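Q: For a teaching session next week I want to show students how multiple molecules come together into a single three-dimensional assembly. I've collected the sequence lines for a complex. Could you give me the predicted structure tokens for the whole thing so I can convert them for display?
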Amino acid sequence: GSGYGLGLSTRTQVTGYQFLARRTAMALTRWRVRMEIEPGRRQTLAVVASVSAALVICLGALLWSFISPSGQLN
Amino acid sequence: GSGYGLGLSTRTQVTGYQFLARRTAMALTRWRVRMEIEPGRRQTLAVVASVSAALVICLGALLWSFISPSGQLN
Amino acid sequence: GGMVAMVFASGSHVFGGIGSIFPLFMMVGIMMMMFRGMGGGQQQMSRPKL
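A: Of course. Below is the structure for the complete assembly, covering every listed component.
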């Protein structure tokens, strides 16, 4: 009983837990839970987009390395 | 009070306000709210169409600049 | 992006500087159609009818 150990888990349960967490994070800072709008996710996605944009530029430079080879000490 | 300050807002609230703005604007010029047809929209859209045509023409001009430049002498 | 990369690797260098406005506006135009656009059949509500 009590769910001890590392048992397998259903995908339906994964979003369930992640939902209760977001709701709980809001209570600590906004002290309310009506959540007409959910800024937590909106604010999080913007960071993911920035990191993603940075990786794209690195691929560009890596691609440039194959178009016109040259070198520097490393 | 209620409604004061910079609180959050939703997409349904944005159209709701723009509807009230259009409805009140004609009430100042036509003294009736029937709004059988909405000429303000059309008059406004007409300007946007005008602006779009100007941008299209100058991009067309920029397209002309690369196809037959000034430096092709002799 | 591949066409631009293909042209830059070919050495035409025509898209350098101000010439870049063509790929740029096209890329933005595609973005408007894919992220916004309009709702489907189960979204019968819309600004003209609401």
